Design a protein around this ligand. Structure first.
Ligand SMILES: [Ca+2]
Ligand SMILES: [Ca+2]
Ligand SMILES: [Ca+2]
Ligand SMILES: [Ca+2]
Ligand SMILES: [Zn+2]
Length: 316
């Protein structure tokens, strides 16, 4: 759409009020011209046909309940863009300011969200297992991060490389949640999962076992479901990343924490410079050690912490 940049106001899935960047041309569209080549939010109208219609509103006020998921998908994609730009100096997912597109109200009672190789898609949930998925900043960042991976390491979505792909997305979605200071934690999807039960989440980085996921390589899923356990085995890596950041003793192995900022820096460098499509857990270990070496020196505490972390989870 060609028009005048303006700012509207709306309420998100959680009932929070926010300002969003809009474009005016007869109607007010969910098109943010201030970030790269734009952030565009579409209405999929309960259908599966993508992307759907660019979101149009008559008065620049997004307070209807049907508006909620679109407000959050559009605002949270802005925050994620900002995190990548400000923190890692990367312009959009491809590093060249590619337009970011999201579709909301996809299908009926769809309990998932995903990156389809070209755009983000968000279900509205069935109302009990989930509420609209765009209401979780970690979910939005998890998804956008799959775009980043796609354009850099290109990790195949299966087995070890796929679990690495999932872990990266969980790591960066959690860093974006801390970055926005939106009640941050080391859990995934807490804000949108089981609106009736308090205190739970989809996955835990601090304690993957809480939900049955492995926290050690010896406990790794060797089967066939979930593409060889891409969402299961990511727990071994998520735990390694939580220990590098925060520290702790795990299976008797002690890790001194180096904090979140360094964890983001070492992971981004491993991602963009050393990982390949078919990298396995042992290769991620070498890639992380080499990044921390590049950045802090071979004899740094940072490098020492990365080794301890992987030894704590049985990776190498
Ligand atoms: Ca309106
Ligand atoms: Ca949170
Ligand atoms: Ca979270
Ligand atoms: Ca819940
Ligand atoms: Zn994912």
């Amino acid at each position: 759409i060609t028009g005048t940049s303006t700012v509207g106001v709306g309420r998100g899935v959680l009932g929070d009020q926010k300002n969003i960047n809009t474009t005016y041309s007869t109607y007010y569209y969910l098109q943010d011209n201030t970030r790269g080549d734009g952030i565009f939010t579409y209405d999929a109208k309960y259908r599966t046909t993508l992307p759907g219609s660019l979101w149009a509103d008559a008065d620049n006020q997004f307070f209807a309940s049907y508006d909620a998921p679109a407000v959050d998908a559009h605002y949270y994609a802005g925050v994620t863009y900002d995190y990548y730009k400000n923190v890692h100096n990367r312009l959009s997912y491809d590093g060249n300011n590619a337009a970011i597109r999201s579709s909301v109200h996809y299908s009926q009672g769809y309990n998932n969200a995903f990156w389809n190789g070209s755009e983000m898609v968000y279900g509205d949930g069935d109302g009990q297992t989930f509420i609209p998925l765009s209401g979780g900043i970690d979910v939005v960042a998890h998804e956008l991060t799959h775009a980043v991976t796609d354009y850099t390491a290109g990790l195949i979505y299966q087995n070890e490389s796929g679990a690495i792909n999932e872990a990266i997305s969980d790591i960066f979605g959690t860093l974006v949640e801390f970055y926005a200071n939106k009640n941050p934690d080391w859990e995934i999807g807490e804000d949108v999962y089981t609106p009736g039960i308090s205190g739970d989440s989809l996955r835990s980085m601090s304690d993957p076992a809480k939900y049955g996921d492995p926290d050690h390589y010896s406990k790794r899923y060797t089967g066939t479901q979930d593409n060889g356990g891409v969402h299961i085995n990511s727990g071994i890596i998520n735990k390694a990343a939580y220990l590098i950041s925060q520290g702790g003793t795990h299976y008797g192995v002690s890790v001194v924490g180096i904090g979140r900022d360094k964890l983001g820096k070492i992971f981004y460098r491993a991602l963009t410079q050393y990982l390949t499509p078919t990298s396995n857990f042992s290769q991620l270990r070498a890639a992380a050690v080499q990044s921390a070496t590049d950045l802090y020196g071979s004899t740094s505490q940072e490098v020492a912490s990365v080794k301890q972390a992987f030894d704590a989870v049985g990776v190498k």
